[PDB]
């Protein structure tokens, strides 16, 4: 049973980072589109 | 006549900041993929 | 936010490589010769030992970019001596979440609680709502056709 | 060796998916920077 738990916990842990990755993707592109609003802004 | 001199100047103080902006982007792309290139790493590693 | 992700990344490998492995199937005397052999110094050679930085700022107008060094033995702006230096945060996402809030980029024409927020977030910015000093929009070049 | 096959048919699948998803990325950043140089050329 131990390799099937260390199994379970590498799958959790993977899908953790993806998780992690996604919110981070999501994040900069939020920051980006602020950076365009802010610049169409001083530009308006 | 005092308009196309402000936008004339406004145009010049926004240049620097545009191409700047442009500029910083250019190597954008670049550091995306440098920053995916791990993931590749782990997904043949996985694969292995 | 770079060196967190950076940081990340070098413990994802460590942790890959440490699972692969468990499964498989010093200038004293460069100074010194230096100053024996040219018998000068000059002070771009002092800072030439640590890490420099640049900033440059180029533009449209001609092909030449704007080089600027700083201090790295000082905590001065750009510098890295002691930790996370001067990065000139916290007074951009506050004024997006506000122009994005009512969809108008205009903070002129926002609600009271926007520009209350406005008013405390940013203490120099309450000396153009109470509309003191009227001056035809904002064109600090007037002097030439002033004159 | 079904299980095994179905292990490498989803992994080949993943991957497949993880390169549209980087090259999705790489046309849309392609395409920002192409409509950035468009508004610069309008505003030269």
Same mark, same amino acid.
């Given at each position: 049973?131990?390799?099937?738990?260390?199994?379970?916990?590498?799958?959790?842990?993977? #899908?953790?980072?993806?998780?992690?990755?996604? %919110? &981070? /993707?999501? $994040?900069?592109?939020?920051? #980006?589109?602020?950076?365009?609003?802010?610049? %169409? &802004? /001083?530009? $308006? | 006549?005092?308009?196309?001199?402000?936008?004339?100047?406004?145009?010049?103080?926004?240049?620097?900041?545009?191409?700047?902006?442009?500029?910083?982007?250019?190597?954008?792309?670049?550091?995306?993929?440098?920053?995916?290139?791990?993931?590749?790493?782990?997904?043949?590693?996985?694969?292995? | 936010?770079?060196?967190?992700?950076?940081?990340?990344?070098?413990?994802?490998?460590?942790?890959?490589?440490?699972?692969?492995?468990?499964?498989?199937?010093?200038?004293?005397?460069?100074?010194?010769?230096?100053?024996?052999?040219?018998?000068?110094?000059?002070?771009?050679?002092?800072?030439?030992?640590?890490?420099?930085?640049?900033?440059?700022?180029?533009?449209?107008?001609?092909?030449?970019?704007?080089?600027?060094?700083?201090?790295?033995?000082?905590?001065?702006?750009?510098?890295?001596?002691?930790?996370?230096?001067?990065?000139?945060?916290?007074?951009?996402?506050?004024?997006?979440?506000?122009?994005?809030?009512?969809?108008?980029?205009?903070?002129?024409?926002?609600?009271?609680?926007?520009?209350?927020?406005?008013?405390?977030?940013?203490?120099?910015?309450?000396?153009?709502?109470?509309?003191?000093?009227?001056?035809?929009?904002?064109?600090?070049?007037?002097?030439?056709?002033?004159?």
């Amino acid at each position: 049973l131990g390799a099937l738990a260390l199994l379970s916990q590498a799958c959790r842990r993977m #899908i953790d980072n993806v998780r992690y990755t996604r %919110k &981070l /993707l999501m $994040d900069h592109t939020e920051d #980006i589109f602020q950076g365009l609003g802010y610049v %169409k &802004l /001083l530009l $308006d | 006549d005092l308009e196309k001199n402000t936008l004339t100047l406004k145009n010049a103080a926004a240049v620097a900041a545009l191409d700047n902006l442009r500029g910083e982007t250019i190597t954008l792309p670049t550091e995306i993929d440098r920053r995916l290139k791990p993931l590749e790493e782990q997904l043949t590693r996985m694969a292995k | 936010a770079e060196t967190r992700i950076q940081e990340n990344n070098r413990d994802v490998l460590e942790l890959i490589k440490r699972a692969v492995n468990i499964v498989n199937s010093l200038m004293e005397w460069f100074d010194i010769c230096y100053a024996q052999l040219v018998s000068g110094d000059t002070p771009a050679d002092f800072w030439k030992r640590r890490p420099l930085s640049i900033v440059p700022r180029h533009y449209a107008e001609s092909p030449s970019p704007l080089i600027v060094v700083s201090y790295n033995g000082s905590s001065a702006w750009g510098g890295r001596i002691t930790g996370s230096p001067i990065l000139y945060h916290s007074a951009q996402a506050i004024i997006d979440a506000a122009c994005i809030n009512a969809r108008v980029d205009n903070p002129q024409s926002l609600h009271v609680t926007a520009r209350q927020e406005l008013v405390a977030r940013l203490p120099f910015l309450a000396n153009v709502l109470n509309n003191q000093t009227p001056l035809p929009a904002f064109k600090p070049g007037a002097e030439m056709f002033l004159n």
